[PDB]
Design a protein around this ligand. Sequence first.
Ligand SMILES: NCCCC[C@H](N)C(=O)NS(=O)(=O)OC[C@H]1O[C@@H](n2cnc3c(N)ncnc32)[C@H](O)[C@@H]1O
Ligand SMILES: NCCCC[C@H](N)C(=O)NS(=O)(=O)OC[C@H]1O[C@@H](n2cnc3c(N)ncnc32)[C@H](O)[C@@H]1O
Ligand SMILES: [Mg+2]
Ligand SMILES: [Mg+2]
Lengths: 484, 484
Amino acid sequence: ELNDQLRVRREKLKKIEELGVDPFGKRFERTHKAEELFELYGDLSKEELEEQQIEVAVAGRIMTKRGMGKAGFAHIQDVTGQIQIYVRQDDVGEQQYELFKISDLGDIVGVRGTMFKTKVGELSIKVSSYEFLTKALRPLPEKDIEQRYRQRYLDLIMNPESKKTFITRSLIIQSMRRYLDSHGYLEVETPMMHAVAGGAAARPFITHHNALDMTLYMRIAIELHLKRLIVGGLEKVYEIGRVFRNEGISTRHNPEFTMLELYEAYADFRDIMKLTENLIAHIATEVLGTTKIQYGEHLVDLTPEWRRLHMVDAIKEYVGVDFWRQMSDEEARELAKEHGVEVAPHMTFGHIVNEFFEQKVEDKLIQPTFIYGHPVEISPLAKKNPDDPRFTDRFELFIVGREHANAFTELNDPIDQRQRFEEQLKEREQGNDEAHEMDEDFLEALEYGMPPTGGLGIGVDRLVMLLTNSPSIRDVLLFPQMRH
Amino acid sequence: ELNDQLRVRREKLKKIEELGVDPFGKRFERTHKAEELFELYGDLSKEELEEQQIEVAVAGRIMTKRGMGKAGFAHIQDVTGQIQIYVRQDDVGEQQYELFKISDLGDIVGVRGTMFKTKVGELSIKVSSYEFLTKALRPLPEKDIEQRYRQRYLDLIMNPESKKTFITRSLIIQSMRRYLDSHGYLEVETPMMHAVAGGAAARPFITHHNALDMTLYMRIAIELHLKRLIVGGLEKVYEIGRVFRNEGISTRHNPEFTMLELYEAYADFRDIMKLTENLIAHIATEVLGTTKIQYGEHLVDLTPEWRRLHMVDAIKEYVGVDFWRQMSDEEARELAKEHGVEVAPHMTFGHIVNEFFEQKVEDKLIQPTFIYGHPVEISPLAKKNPDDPRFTDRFELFIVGREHANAFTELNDPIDQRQRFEEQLKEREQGNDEAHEMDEDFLEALEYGMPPTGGLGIGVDRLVMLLTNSPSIRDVLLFPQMRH
Ligand SMILES: NCCCC[C@H](N)C(=O)NS(=O)(=O)OC[C@H]1O[C@@H](n2cnc3c(N)ncnc32)[C@H](O)[C@@H]1O
Ligand SMILES: NCCCC[C@H](N)C(=O)NS(=O)(=O)OC[C@H]1O[C@@H](n2cnc3c(N)ncnc32)[C@H](O)[C@@H]1O
Ligand SMILES: [Mg+2]
Ligand SMILES: [Mg+2]
């Protein structure tokens, strides 16, 4: 019992046809958004308004209604807010009034009429024509997170704070393309279906092309095709697009997410550090009007210049172990054991250094920080640091304790690039099933010559989380991937 | 005929290393692109250039090189074109001159020098500093059609007009979002991985998520989730994104392509017609400077307003057959036999009408034409025309004989929408594997009430082909799907 009123709504549908109305509407032209009427006419008195007879036409979903007698009111909601309509049978006539009376919460209508103020003072529209636009067969639920994510639409109608996050997300990506376009980076589109899933260390989604009878992998990264565009002489390219990773959900991961990948010939990772803080600072200024923002319990300062800290120096500062020292893989393992860092059988010194960083340091980096110099074994596409080849000129950007970007001075030496892949294939033998695969095609492109280049990848959803103060990626995705 | 070249290029690599240089270079700062040089200094006399000593720095790939002992020339190519450089041991010293002498066609280098003109009058750079940037292990090609899609980068380097097509492509997309954004449409991002592949008639790519253990379908359309947004009250939304259909390629089909879908609450298909022609004409204007373009042997006038033609009327016009009269399925079958129109076993009058249009008519549609009134049977998500429900208030945009867009007054009645789905399941039981699938989720969404709405889908690559006079979609994708 209770939802039996579903029969009541179903009933109200045929009655509307009997009134001779299309219960699902026709086009309806409007003159204004609810918020505009307030902004334009909110300060005119009841008298100045009857005086000016402003005609307007608006449409929206009925959120509240109080009829009775031969006149009633209702609050109608458009994407900008609600506006009260006053409907009297003496104005709209018998027929349209019956339509108003039979109208229910959830139903969508359009009206033409004049701006007016009741004796209570609430700006309203004194209706001259009432148009039924669409019958809601179910009532809007009673004002869980299951529903907000599984039925985003109800969340968007009932929770203004949620709809603004999505509008800001739009502004953020728009702001991003604007900066990137004005700085000469060419926007491009590369394949999301790959012969070989490469460009990152991740598990791919596998699919099949019936006609070509070929196995394809949804891309886990945009990197290798953008490098082919740098060999192509395109110099500055970027792509803000979807990438897919066959991994579980979390407050920071969605299997399909949005990544910005960007390449710039003749720059190195220090140049990309400057670009990354400037871009982001550009975006926060443009959308929030300030680079000082609040995220959860933190006051995060996005004002460039951001802190630069070598991964090894970070481990020294936050744990006290000094990996600058040349040591054997076993000594690294002993250290791991002593400090509670979990390590896998395919791991050697380099991987272990990164585990110390991930497991004991990461969550402590609240202010924007470029952690750089990642060990060569976890950076198969980055160029080795000329002074200490155990590390590469790579950096990751951390803020509020989490990874927001990855970037590097690109490895453009095909011989060295082929060896990194051989090293990865070996690791896969020892069980690292996220190790990159061989991609002969990519190697042959490199062999035609790729100029020294600086590359960058930003998790766009995570940046949006940060700039809208969303605790979870599920809050910045219209339709997050649900379990079950 | 041999890899002696590969070998000699490897030999030089060791040689430039033994000269103390990083054969894969470091960052390199530039002041100009070859293009701006010509634009700024192409008109200056040879002697005022000598007097002025205008210092510049540029970088690019060596396309031509001519020896002659202790002074040499080369043309280096950047993304804007090529500039001749003049290098003499006289000026740059022996170690840089040696670097220049080893440099091959294909290698990438940077130079600092002053502007000057040769006796011949050619604007050039008198090199003061020669930086070796990257060794190409593989020779640039000499001076087929499949080859260049297979190695787009070779094509981008050797063929000027080539990158142009892609630069135009990005300008076309950018111009589309600017128009859409300024007209109130909210750019959004909805799922590409679906529980049920819907929004179109097409076979999907199927994949699986390991952790969640679930079958996922790559989207074949953007429609169902944008419609959820319209139920959600957002009013105007659009998304320019990749879509996936598991079908063979053709000069107008790629398995992954870019579609623009947009929805507008309170509008109908006639409003979407006007939006479509104003949006496309605007893009041609903004990007090409004209609405008159060349495509193959045709001069297409994209200036509004375009021709509106009812599908049935088009059939009477080009075929001489009438379908306005009430007619039986068997009579439609007879007409088809008489006219050589192929029909399947599940087809009835409505499908047959569309088969007459597609097989005998659409290829004659050269100038922009809104063909409208598609039969209800082939339009499961469009609202029936009220005066004659055998047809729907839908249109497809044809230009140069090919479908560029699809649109309709949306079916927002959930009862009818469920019926259409059921009819689709029967057609499937009857051999139509393109039939739509039942999506209870989408239906639930409509039960909350979707306002009357006008929707639109535009094949973005097809639009790009049109405005760049590209005969195949493969000419506008940087990396088109290759056959094994
Ligand atoms: N050539 C220089 C590096 C370029 C980027 C490299 N190809 C890349 O993919 N690196 S990444 O760190 O693996 O991915 C980039 C970012 O995407 C974000 N990301 C990664 N996986 C997810 C998931 N699963 N959800 C949301 N966001 C994600 C996160 O901020 C990462 O910093
Ligand atoms: N709700 C109103 C209709 C919205 C669009 C609907 N969801 C849609 O998918 N229609 S479509 O006609 O099937 O696709 C839209 C356009 O995409 C283009 N398209 C379709 N398939 C391909 C392929 N495979 N390659 C390139 N372009 C394609 C073509 O121009 C179509 O007109
Ligand atoms: Mg990373
Ligand atoms: Mg179509």
